[PDB]
Amino acid sequence: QQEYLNNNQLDCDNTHNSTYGNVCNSVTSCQSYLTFKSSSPEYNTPSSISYLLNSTPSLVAKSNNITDVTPIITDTMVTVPVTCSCSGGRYQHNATYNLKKTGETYFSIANNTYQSLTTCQALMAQNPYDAKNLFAGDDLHVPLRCACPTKKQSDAGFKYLLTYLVSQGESPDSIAEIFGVDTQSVLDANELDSKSVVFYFTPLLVPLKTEPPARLQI
């Protein structure tokens, strides 16, 4: 279980503990997954998506049953295998991001470029630049959100946790059905209950019993 981000990442001045990352509460390192929506023309191949998220093109290709050079149709949600590890008391998967345009902000990088796979708060905490001193060509340390199954989750049969970018219309019920797991396992993984509002566009942890399906929309 990890705290649910609960839209606290939408205000860069918000200081809720969840915004600085999942908490290191299990094994120091594990295999994990992110999700990411293909974006044309910059992030729509295994090469460019892996470059943004620090995976490998072969891992992205195999995870989605495509080749490592296959163009991915815009808005397709793909799975991205990554190593999740503990750093500074948090679980995260490191990536590096070079700003392309002077005008990009900590928030635009977290919310738009990385599709809320990281937060403004974690970016600011792990980079030296002032929010008013970012220029094209600056490299950012990007702490992508992932977690490793706790002992209790492992004992329940979950081999991985997957960081799931919730889309319009989706619910814990419908997301659990994609991965063939119980709705209650999804709720428990995020410390939610059936009355909790699950926000669109905010990452949600999904515990997995096996590797994710190659196509999420099936």
Ligand X SMILES: *[C@@H]1O[C@H](CO)[C@@H](O[C@@H]2O[C@H](CO)[C@@H](O)[C@H](O)[C@H]2NC(C)=O)[C@H](O)[C@H]1NC(C)=O
Ligand Y SMILES: *[C@@H]1O[C@H](CO)[C@@H](O[C@@H]2O[C@H](CO)[C@@H](O[C@@H]3O[C@H](CO)[C@@H](O)[C@H](O)[C@@H]3O)[C@H](O)[C@H]2NC(C)=O)[C@H](O)[C@H]1NC(C)=O
Binding site for ligand NAG (CB under 6 A): 17, 23, 65, 89, 214
Backbone gaps in the chain, preceding residues (C–N over 2.5 A): none
Of 89 and 103, CB closest to ligand NAG: 89
CB-based contact 124:162 (threshold 8 Å): no
Residue 153 tokens, joined: 């989750």
Q: Please return the burial class of 27, using the count of CB atoms within 10 Å of its CB with bins 0-12, 13-18 and 19+.
A: middle
* Pick 94 or 108: Cβ nearer ligand Y: 94
Q: Which of 85, 116, 119, 190 binds ligand Y (CB under 6 A)?
A: 85
Among 25, 87, 167, 202, binds ligand Y (CB under 6 A): 87
Backbone angles phi, psi at 89, to 5 degrees: 80, 5
Closest approach of ligand NAG to the CB of residue 66, in Å: 9
| CB-count exposure of residue 154 (10 Å: 0-12, 13-18, 19+) | middle
Is residue 94 close enough to count as binding ligand Y by CB under 6 A?
yes
Q: Which one of ligand Y, ligand X, ligand NAG, none is in contact with 111 (Cβ closer than 5 to 8 A by kind)?
A: ligand X
121 touching ligand X, by CB under 6 A: no
The Cα–Cα gap between 85 and 91 comes to 5
Nearest CA to 36 out of 77, 96, 69, 83 is that of 77
Nearer to ligand X, 67 or 112 (CB): 112
> What are the two backbone dihedrals, phi and then psi, of residue 118, each rounded to the nearest 5 degrees?
-140, 180
The minimum distance between CB 186 and ligand NAG, in angstroms, equals 22
Q: Is 201 in the site for ligand X (CB under 6 A)?
A: yes
Beta strands in the chain (DSSP E): 22-23, 29-37, 77-87, 90-98, 139-144, 160-165, 203-208
- Contact partner, 201, from ligand X, ligand Y, ligand NAG, none, Cβ < 5-8 Å per class: ligand X
Query: Minimum distance between the CB of residue 201 and ligand X, rounded to whole angstroms?
Result: 3
Q: Which is nearer to ligand NAG, 131 or 214 (CB)?
A: 214
Q: Which is nearer to ligand X, 27 or 77 (CB)?
A: 77
Q: How far is the CB of 169 from ligand X (least distance, A)?
A: 11
# residues contacting ligand X (CB under 6 A)? 3
The least distance separating ligand X from the CB of residue 142, rounded to whole angstroms, comes to 16
- φ/ψ of 108, rounded to 5, equals -65, -35
Separate counts of helices (H) and strands (E) for the chain: 7, 7
Chain residues binding ligand X by CB under 6 A are 111-112, 201
